[PDB]
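Figure caption, in words: inputs first, then the predicted bound structure.
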Amino acid sequence: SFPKYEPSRLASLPTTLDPAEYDISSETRKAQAERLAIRSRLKREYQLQYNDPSRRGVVEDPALIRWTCARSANVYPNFRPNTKTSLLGALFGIGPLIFWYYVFKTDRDRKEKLIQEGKLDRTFNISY
Amino acid sequence: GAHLARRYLGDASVEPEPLRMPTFPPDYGFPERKEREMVATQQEMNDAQLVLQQRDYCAHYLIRFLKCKRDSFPNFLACKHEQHDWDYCEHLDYVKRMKEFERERRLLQRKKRREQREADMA
Amino acid sequence: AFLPSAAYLTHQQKVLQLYKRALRHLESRCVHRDKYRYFACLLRARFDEHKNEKDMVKATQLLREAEKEFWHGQHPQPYIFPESPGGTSYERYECYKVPEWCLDDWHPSEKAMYPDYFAKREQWKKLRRESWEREVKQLQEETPVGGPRTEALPPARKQGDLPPLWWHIVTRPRERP
Amino acid sequence: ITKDMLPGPYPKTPEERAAAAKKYNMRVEDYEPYPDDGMGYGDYPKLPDRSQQERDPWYDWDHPDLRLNWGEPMHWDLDMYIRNRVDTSPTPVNWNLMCKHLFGFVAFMLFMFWVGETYPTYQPVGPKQYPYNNLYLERGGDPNKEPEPVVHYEI
Amino acid sequence: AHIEPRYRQFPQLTRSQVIQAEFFSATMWFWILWRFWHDSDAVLGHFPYPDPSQWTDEELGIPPD
Amino acid sequence: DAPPLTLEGIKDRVLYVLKLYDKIDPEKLSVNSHFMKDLGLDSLDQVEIIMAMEDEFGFEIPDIDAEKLMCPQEIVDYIADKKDVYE
Amino acid sequence: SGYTPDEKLRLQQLRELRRRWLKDQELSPREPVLPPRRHSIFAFTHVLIPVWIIHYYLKYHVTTKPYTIVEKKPRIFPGDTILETGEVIPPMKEFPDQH
Amino acid sequence: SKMELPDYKQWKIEGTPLETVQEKLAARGLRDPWGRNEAWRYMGGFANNVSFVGALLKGFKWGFAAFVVAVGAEYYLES
Amino acid sequence: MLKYIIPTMMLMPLTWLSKNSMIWINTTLHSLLISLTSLLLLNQFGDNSLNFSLTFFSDSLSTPLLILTMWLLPLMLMASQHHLSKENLARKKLFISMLILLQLFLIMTFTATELIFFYIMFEATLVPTLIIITRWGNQTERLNAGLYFLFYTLAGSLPLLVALIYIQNTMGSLNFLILQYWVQPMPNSWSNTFMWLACMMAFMVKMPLYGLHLWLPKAHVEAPIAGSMVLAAILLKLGGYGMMRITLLLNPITDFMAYPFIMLSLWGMIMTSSICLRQTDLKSLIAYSSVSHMALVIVAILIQTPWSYMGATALMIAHGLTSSMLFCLANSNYERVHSRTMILARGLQTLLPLMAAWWLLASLTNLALPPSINLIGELFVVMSTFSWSNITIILMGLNMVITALYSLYMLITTQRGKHTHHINNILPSFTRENALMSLHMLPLLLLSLNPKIILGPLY
Ligand SMILES: *C(=O)CCCCCCCCCCCCC
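Bound structure (myristic acid present):
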C-alpha cells in the first residue's frame, strides 16, 4: 500500500505520524500538565520582570549563562582521558598533519628532482 | 546522419573517419588534377587583419564584404550582395569538402571489395 | 502538543486540524475552482461518513490511517499565504518595526516637531506607571499557590483599572509601519 | 547569578539528578544527561535534537525569531540548529530515496556523457583546407626555416 | 483620475493602455510577417543540399576495378 | 495599492460572504449569530467558514485562533486586531 | 467552545486600549513643525565639465607618457588611399567569377 | 474611505461550470454549498476568456493589414 | 630615533601634572602630534636603509609598524576613557602611564639594530601589557589569562636569549648590518637543529602558532579594550618582525626545518577558522580569526620568497587595523548590552544604522575584499605558496570560503533579524565611538590607494 515514512538524522518523523502522540494515558496527561505548569511559571516570571516600567536594561536569562558556561568553561573539568578520547584526539589531531606533510613532501621532492634535471618548464618563470 | 549509424552499428572498414584525411594520394584515380588557387595575396590579406580561421581559400569575397561594411556607414543594411557572394563561396567550399568525403568513402569501399575479391580468389 | 491555552490536543481538535490541512493540500493539487469544489465535497462526504462513531479506539485508528493517507498525498510545495510562515513575504517588514522606547532617546530638537504626539506619549506613560502596581497586586492575589498552571492571564477585574501586563500588547508596532 | 546555578559534574546518584533537573527547569523524568564518556558535557541535558524550524510557528515566543522561550534549557547545538542554518524538518519523501535518486541521476548522466565523448557526432565532410602551407607564416612559423610544401587539389 | 478598486467585477481600464497593447501586438505581428516575406531563408534554408548518392564516379575520380 | 480597511467595511465583507452560504438562511443571521447554537451548524462547517474568511481577506487565520471564533462579530474583532484598523 | 467570558472581557479591554493607542498614533496638522529655510544644466555640469577635465588629463598627462594609450592600427583594404604618405594600394586580382 | 458592494443575490451558478459540478454531485447524491461564493468568477468580464491560439494571435488582423499596405507600397515605390 | 623616544617619555610628566578633568584631552592631543611627527620615517632608499646611529636604525619593514603603533596610541586613549570614567584619578594616570610605557618600549623595540637590545625590550613589553590585563580586566579569569600569556612567552623565549648569546660569542657581533655582511651558512647537525628551534620557538609562540595559541583566546577576551588593541595590532606583528629579522642567519637548514611548522599552520588556519563558525563569543571569534591570519603570515615567512615577504608585511598591517576596529565594535556592543555573548543582542541595524555601516565595512575588510590591502597581502601569500607547491591552493581556497563564512555570520547575528524585545537600553551612537571607527578605517582605505609604502624592504 502506502510506503511507510522512516526517520533519519536530518529528516525527523512528523508529529502526526508519531504513535506516542495518540497515547491518552493519565501519566501522559500528568506529564503534559507539569510541563505546562513549568512553562507558565517561567513565562509569568519573564513577563512580570519584562513589563516593568521602572526597569531599563537587559532582562538577563539564567539559561543563556548556563549554556555559555557549559559550552566554554565546563569542558575541561568533565573530561577524563580514556581510550575513546585519546583515540579521537590522536586520529583527528595528528592524522591530517601527517597526511598533508607526506603529500607536500612528496610533491616538492618530485618537483625538485624535475627542476634540477632540467625537465620542468621554467621558461618565463622569473617571479617567485 | 545515416553515416554515423553506418559506422557505429555496421562496420568501420568502409566508413572513413574524420580524424585524418585523406588516406589516399590525390594522384590516385585523378590524372592531371589541378590545385585550388587563391585570389588574395598573403600581404593584402595580412593588412586586412583577417581571423586565422577566416584566412581560408575564399577570403576575396570576405575582403569585399568588409570593404562594403566599412564604406557604407551608417547605411548598415545594404551590403547583402557581397555577403551573399561570400557565403555562396563558402557553400561551394563545403560542397567540395563533402565531395572529398564521398571520394574517400568510395575509395575505401573499393578497397574492401578488392580485398574480399582477392581473399576469395586465392 | 504546544499550546498556550491547553496542555494537550483533543481528538476532535486533531480531526479538525487534519480536515483543514487536507482541504488546503487538496486546493493546492486542484488549482481550478470547480474541480476543487468537486473533490472538496467528496472529502466532506468522506469525513461525514464516519462522523457518528462512538468507539474511541476505532476513531483513533481511523485518524491514524487518515494521517497516513494525508502524508502519502501531500503536495511537495503546497500553497502558503504570503504573510504566513514559509510564505514569500513572511516577516518582511520586521526591519521597520522599531520599538517605541527609542522615542525616549530622541533629541529635544526633533521632539519639538511633534508636540501633541509627545504630550500624548507622556500621558500614556503616566497611565502605565499609575496602573502597574495595581496590575501586579491583582496578579499576586488571583493565581493559586505553586505558580500558575496555565499561561492564560486574568482581565481587569475592578473599575478604573487596566488588565495586567498590557503595555507590550497594546503598544506593539503595526504590520506595515 | 550565584555559583549553584552553573552546570556541574555528571550526576550519578538520583538526588543529584533531581537537583540537576530542578536547576535546568525541567521534569526529573524528562532530564536525560549526556553519557559519561569524558567528553566534557557534564550534567547538561540531551535534548531531542530537533531544529528550530520544527517549533510551532504560531505560538507566541519570548524570542520570536529564535522560536525560543525565556528560561528554557536550550540545546547544546542551538547555534547549529537556528533557522539560518541546517534544518531537520521532515521531507515528503524518504532520505534514502532522495540519496539513491540523486546519485543514480548523476551517475547515469556522467556515464552517458562519457559514452557520447567516446562516440562523437560529425558531418560527412572532408577536413578544412587552408592555403600557403596551412598558413605556415601566419601560424607563427619562422620564415628562415623552409617547411614541407603541402597543397590541396580540386574535386 | 485614479482607478477605484472594484469588488467581484471586472476592473476599470483606460483606453490608452489597451490601445498601446493592441498597437504593439500588431507591430510585432507586422514585423514577423515583413521579415518572413523579405528574408524567408533563415528559417527554411539558404542553399540546396546535394545528397552524395547522385555524384558520378568521374567527378570523384573513382577508378573502375 | 493596498486601500485602507474599516470596521464597517470588513463587517459588510464578512456578512456578504456569509449570506452566500447554502447552509445559512440570510434572513435570520445577525452579527451575534452563533453557528452551532443559534444557526445549528457543525464544527466542520465552522472550519469551512474560517477557510472562506482566509480566502476572502487574503491572510490565514491560525488554527488555535480558528477554533475560538464563534460569531461574526468575533471574526470582525480578530481581523481588526490582526490588521490594526481604525488608527 | 469558543472563549471563556473571562477571556472575552480581556480581549475587549485590550482591543479598546489598542484602538485608543492607534488613534493616538495619528498626526495633528501642524506636525511636523519644520523650521523655515537653469533648465538643462545637467548637460553642462555632469557632461561637459567632465569632458573638459579628462580631455585635459588625457591630452597633457597620459599620452605624454609612452605606451599608455595603444590603439589597434586601422584596417587596410585593396583600393583606398593613405593619408600619411599617399600611396594608392594596388587593386586585387581578377575574380574567376562563380556567378 | 467608503466602499460599496454589489447585490449578493445577483450571483447565480446557472450556465457556469459550477452548475455542472452541482448536478454531478447531485447525481452522486451530494451537494455543493459554496457555489454562490465563487459564482462571480465565471460571470461578468471574467467570463468568455480567450484560449492559447486566441492569445497568441492578438492583434493579428491589424498587423496583417499593415503588412498588406506596406508590401503594396514597396511594390509601387520601386516602379 | 631620539626625536620620537624623548617626546614619548615626556608624555609622562604631561599626564602626571595635568588636571583631573583634562588628562584625556592633553594626552590625545600630544599623542596625535607624535603620530603626525612619525611620518618623517618614510625617507627610505632603494638600496640602503635609514641608519641613525650605532643603536637605532629603521628600514622599510619597521617603518609601517612604527607608524601604526604611534597612530594606535591615541585610538586607545579615546577608547579606554568610558569604562574608566568613574575610576580614581591616580589609577587613571597609572593606566595612561602603562600605555605610554608600552608604546615607548614598542617603538624602541622596532628600531634596535642590535639583537639583544631587541630581545630586552621585546620582553620589556610584557610588563605593562600583563599589568593592564590583570589589573583592569573585568571578570575572574583575567589572572589565569595573564599567567598563561606570561609563561607561554617566557618559556618559549628563554632559549632565544641563550641562542643569541651563543651567536654573540661565535660570530663576534649582534649588529644586524654586520650580521648581514658576516653571515655564514649553517650546516646539517643536531646542534644547528636545536639552534634553529631556539631561534624560532619564541616567535612561534608570539605569532601565535597553532598548538601554542592557547593563550590568545584568554588574553584577548579578559583584557580591556586598549589591551585588546595592543594584543591584536602590535605584539603579534612584533613577533613577525623578529621572525623576519632572525630568519636571515638560519640558512639553509630552514629549507627542511620549516617543513613541520608550515603544516602546523597550513592545517591550523583551517581548524581555527572552523572554530569561528561555532563560537558563542564575539571576542573569541575575533581572537581565532587573528590566529588564522597570523598562521597565514607564518607560512609566508617560512617559505621565504620575496612575494611572500611583501604579502606578509601588507597582511600584518592590514590585519592589525582590521582586528583593532573589530575589537572596538565588539567593545561598543559590550558596553551597551553588558554581556559578551553574540546571540543576546540581535537586529541592531534597526536601531544603530551608522554603526551597522561601520560593522559592514569592517567585515568586508576582514574577508579580504579587493582592492584593500588585506586582499593584497592574502593574494601575494597565495601566489608565493602556489609557487611553493600546488595542492597548497586547496588549503588556501577552502580558507577563502570559511573566512567569509564567519565574517558575514558575524555580520548577521549582531545586526540582522528581529531585535531582542527585552533589551531597551540601546542608546544612540556617540560621536566618540563613530570618530574611533572612522579613525580606524579611513587610514586603511587610504592605504589602498598607495600601498607601496607598506610592501616591505624588498619592494
Ligand atoms: C545523421 O542523422 C546525421 C545528423 C547528426 C546526427 C543525428 C542528429 C539527430 C537530431 C537532430 C535532428 C532532429 C530532427 C527533428
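The interface with chain D takes residues 62-64 of chain F (CB under 8 Å).
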